[PDB]
Structure 1
């Protein structure tokens, strides 16, 4: 009865591969080559030749384990609290185990989705007072070594200025040889409303959305460009490929909420239960995500 995560819509089927780990890390090694100097000319006799060097890098992904506790009614004490229609003490907000677990799971899943998208964990609408997480734990919005574009505050309502920064970021994007792949776009609803105005005396032929699709289609070898709207974002746009070779998601198989065996029981009718979930497992190559921030000063 618990709804599916919406983060499944931000990734391709091949981009997600589950791992078996609760808390710990996983390491990957990537090899690379470089040229030291200009090539040597083979004329007459020579033994001093130019060199080609190699370098190695280690990428480590951190996985963290988290828990929540919630109170509910003891199983044997349900019958003394059931009513005509509702089940549970309305005056004191106490629910059976099944109902309490279901609501709690949905809330945790919403938090899990927020972290994957925004890379942070917080319960404040202001977004402050965040939970200090481990390094090597990044989301699609806080990922380092990616293209960041900032729109000036005075041009927040100028769609042309916004599209200008998008083009600048798209130019700086480097897909290498993996360009032939679909693309994914995530916008806030306010941005989505701006995207349906006619393209700019203003034209009456195409829409800003159509121009954006064509512009992205230039760099993805005319591949599909899916657009998604998320209320989580605020004046921010995300563009990144849907290729596993560039961005891959390796979550723990215990990432989604799971009940814990320990149950706190007392002489009264109130019991407590615990839910476990795992955070982490996002890996992305350098300079493959476009992050546009519209300053709302």
Structure 2
């Protein structure tokens, strides 16, 4: 194959240069499990037992015993497949555009296949990370003109049946009001018996800067960040708490546990960018190529994610 398909050989050499996604930091190693498909749906069944009555004493002779029931729930996860096309130079045509310092046509914005693929892969990965955190696909900084997606395709920010808190516009700078809502949201969380788990916090940089201020007269030797860490530790049974900063978020705080039993990420094994065998070729030096990637595979339990939105109006 590598003796026949130059483009396949080029991708194999250049695949190591693509950087790992930042979404890996948002999840524990145990929370991510690969599945095997490209487009469609999968079903997961969770079995739970229950006690139907008080236990019975084993005294003398008896044959009437209490019963233990069972029940199951099924959750359907929708996946999707998307593709992008990019132009580049034909392999035989590179030698006629090689220069002493670079290869390519500067005037017409044409690259060798290896360079174009690496840049195109990086752009796709950024869009992948945006969807995982936000649940939406868009290329506008305004966030409008979103691509309509399938049902049962949610991200962390748009997962339904989760706790959402809104900070009023007038209190957007009042850190005390912000912490008031967070505590209320932390109260409404329902972790069941899995509360003894590490937690993860994601904040936009603007909120991150507000946190590093000294904790409020005023005090010292303590920051708003540490106050948040203690408050979260009150509900996770004094477990570890991690904080991360993502430029993708805007005036929003995300809190969710790091227990696979509550939130699990099950993406396709072909989610990351993958080259396509179809390569358009003409009489000129311009060729076209396609890259494929798969979206979907986030599963979470009801009322286990806290979403604080700071209204900047």
Same fold flag (TM > 0.5): yes
Q: Match of 1:104, SS?
A: helix
Corresponding residue of 2:279: 263
- 1:29 Cα deviation from its structure 2 partner: 2.3
**Distance in 1, Cα, partners of 2:187 & 2:63:** 44
Residue-by-residue CA offset, 1:204-258 (whole Å, 9 max, x unaligned):
2311001000111111111111110000000000011111110000000000000
Change in 2 beyond 3 A, CA 1:289/1:77: same
**Distance in 1, Cα, partners of 2:52 & 2:242:** 42
- 73-82 or 199-208, which deviates more: 199-208
**Distance in 2, Cα, partners of 1:85 & 1:46:** 92
Q: Aligned-pair RMSD on alpha carbons?
A: 2.8
Change in 2 beyond 3 A, CA 1:47/1:13: closer
- 1:45 Cα deviation from its structure 2 partner: 19
Corresponding residue of 1:294: 310
Change in 2 beyond 3 A, CA 1:44/1:20: closer
- 1:123 Cα deviation from its structure 2 partner: 0.5
Structure 2, gaps ≥5 residues long = 1-16
- 50-59 or 20-29, which deviates more: 50-59
**Distance in 2, Cα, partners of 1:238 & 1:55:** 32
- 1:44 Cα deviation from its structure 2 partner: 19
Question: Which of 83, 104, 122 is equivalent to 2:138?
Answer: 122
- 1:20 Cα deviation from its structure 2 partner: 0.3
Q: Match of 2:73, SS?
A: strand
Change in 2 beyond 3 A, CA 1:201/1:15: same
- 1:203 Cα deviation from its structure 2 partner: 1.6
- 1-10 or 25-34, which deviates more: 25-34
Residue-by-residue CA offset, 1:7-37 (whole Å, 9 max, x unaligned):
0000000000000010011101234578999
- 1:156 Cα deviation from its structure 2 partner: 0.3
Q: How many residue pairs are counted as aligned between the two chains? A: 297
Corresponding residue of 1:60: 76
Change in 2 beyond 3 A, CA 1:36/1:127: farther
- 1:101 Cα deviation from its structure 2 partner: 0.2
**Distance in 1, Cα, partners of 2:66 & 2:33:** 42
Structure 1, gaps ≥5 residues long = none
Change in 2 beyond 3 A, CA 1:277/1:51: same
> Going by fraction, where is helix more abundant, 1 or 2?
2
- 1:57 Cα deviation from its structure 2 partner: 2.8
**Distance in 2, Cα, partners of 1:37 & 1:194:** 53
1:109 aligns with 2:125: yes
Corresponding residue of 2:61: 45
Residue-by-residue CA offset, 1:158-192 (whole Å, 9 max, x unaligned):
01100110000000011111111111000000001
- 1:202 Cα deviation from its structure 2 partner: 1.5
1:212 aligns with 2:228: yes
**Distance in 1, Cα, partners of 2:212 & 2:129:** 27
- 1:104 Cα deviation from its structure 2 partner: 0.1
Q: Match of 1:219, SS?
A: coil
